Amino acid sequence: KLVRLPGLIDVHVHLREDFASGTAAALAGGITMVCAMPNTRPPIIDAPALALAQKLAEAGARCDFALFLGASSENAGTLGTVAGSAAGLKLYLNETFSELRLDSVVQWMEHFETWPSHLPIVAHAEQQTVAAVLMVAQLTQRSVHICHVARKEEILLIKAAKARGLPVTCEVAPHHLFLSHDDGEVRPELGSRQDVEALWENMAVIDCFASDHAPHTLEEKCRPPPGFPGLETMLPLLLTAVSEGRLSLDDLLQRLHHNPRRIFHLPPQEDTYVEVDLEHEWTIPSHMPFSKAHWTPFEGQKVKGTVRRVVLRGEVAYIDGQVLVPPGYGQDVRKWPQGAVPQLPPSPERPRR
Amino acid sequence: KLVRLPGLIDVHVHLREDFASGTAAALAGGITMVCAMPNTRPPIIDAPALALAQKLAEAGARCDFALFLGASSENAGTLGTVAGSAAGLKLYLNETFSELRLDSVVQWMEHFETWPSHLPIVAHAEQQTVAAVLMVAQLTQRSVHICHVARKEEILLIKAAKARGLPVTCEVAPHHLFLSHDDGEVRPELGSRQDVEALWENMAVIDCFASDHAPHTLEEKCRPPPGFPGLETMLPLLLTAVSEGRLSLDDLLQRLHHNPRRIFHLPPQEDTYVEVDLEHEWTIPSHMPFSKAHWTPFEGQKVKGTVRRVVLRGEVAYIDGQVLVPPGYGQDVRKWPQGAVPQLPPSPERPRR
8 A cells, every 4th residue: 555745855966967867866766856956067156057057957857956056266246146046055165176165264154145145055064064154154144054964963063053043954864864884985974873873863953854866976986076876765765764663754754845845945846746655675776777876875775665656747757667757847946936935025116108 | 761561461372391491481572471271291181180280380480370271072071170270271173182182063062061151261263163163152152262363264253253242252373463374384374465464454353462382392393283482572573563553552462461361360460560672673583592492483583672671579580681580480370369260159157066
């Protein structure tokens, strides 16, 4: 007997893997909407790059999407006209490509001050950098979302900030819940067993799950790029945990549906749902069927939970190992009227002619 | 004609150079009270180490002093009984000796939560670490003093925090005001010309000057220890700047007398003053007369300003190239009744017998 879930949302996906293959992997993982990161080549750090990327996504995407803009050392104060068309703004505050490297905390402040106040900001921030960006958010009187929290240190800092009523949310990736040192390159590095246990213990503090799908081939992992492929394995791993009583189905759906929607102001998808079989036990293979990454760090893990069918806006998009919607079926949700972020009137009545 | 100054205070001095030679250098630099750092060998990170260091200082010091305790990964919550006898608590948040290394921002939080709330905390914090420790201070609802601010990035962050009414103070060392890249190992690294200019432009943001006197020999600088010797050169450099109109005499005395007193609750020194000659032009030699460091990064700089006489508690302590008070003349100011930090009653009326 199948369980019907709403269309799940992954707010942290890297596609350079193209839009068509990445979104195929998404659908096979029971994900119907993705937010794609700006650290492409070239990176999405200005209006022309965003415009091109949006059209490429519209033509190649099989599920729905929004595209992030990336903060650079040169673009603060220049993105205001296109900001509302993006998922949000992403700051890369630790190791990154020179194009996205910020030289100084004053540059972080400039972004927080110039980016429209009603639109999302995500920060890749590890260890003390979480504390640093939280300070910038407070100084500029706005919210921030922290991605791939991986350490006890980080989740406890975020917990302390929430206890003081600060507007911070966060996400955790499956490899930081289901892999550790014992078990391999990724940023944030895999944590210790104590880090993993801390993340589970503090599940109440975690607002979202997101894959941080980063589809490098082994030839490229083995000057190592950070990241693991994860779109096809995320939901099966989490369903296994649900079936073991580690979290509830509702806990899962808050973190892969409701909280992504409300933090990023992502719209509902009409006639969209995912059917899963909670009974089927299987072993994760050396590589999953869809991602061009062609490897997975979860190889060998036993899981219970499989995506059987995905319906997206009234069409069968995925069934039992086959994706049935073509490249281009997917749409930019920021272009839907219900996908615009609500805003106070910034900041004709009497036509002359 | 001489100018009489009050007894100047250097709140950032490393003595392993012993107490007698370091305090001789202090007096020759017109400094009558020093706060000595805990990064000795062994470090001052527990009650027995503090007790021994206090007696060694009492026996060797030629000027008055207070000793910092150092935060470790093991001593949070253990220092409460001796905390009030120290200058304050110092956290080393960037590169340091393993003994003083803190593994996680949660350890910083633990120190901020456990150290008595009415007593000083100083943090060595560079670049984003300044933002991180400021966040910890806000989360724990208390003040923090940041040492050796060296970069435009850092002083502007502190300026922004002050504009939001946050309880933060800071200090700047002379090498960060009078040397730059152009001109050599030290932490914080020497800044660019733009960093130096930013510090001068934002003098209003700087609460204290302090030497960060770190008396390594060249044999040890040339696994490089961070720091420069600076006790004997600090005041002459700053007097030169005063004579050039870069800051006023009052600006200088706020930063080397009044603000050190009020941030660290250091007591007045009775019958104590420093006489300086503002007319004498001289060139800083390859090494100053007193410090065992036996070198100086300011070699070759022309200065105008010389310490002629220092009187400490009614005795002539220094005159024209000779220190006249013996090792042991100096006292622990935290033992003076006026040197205790005021505190609400924590936290006999009816004798039984």
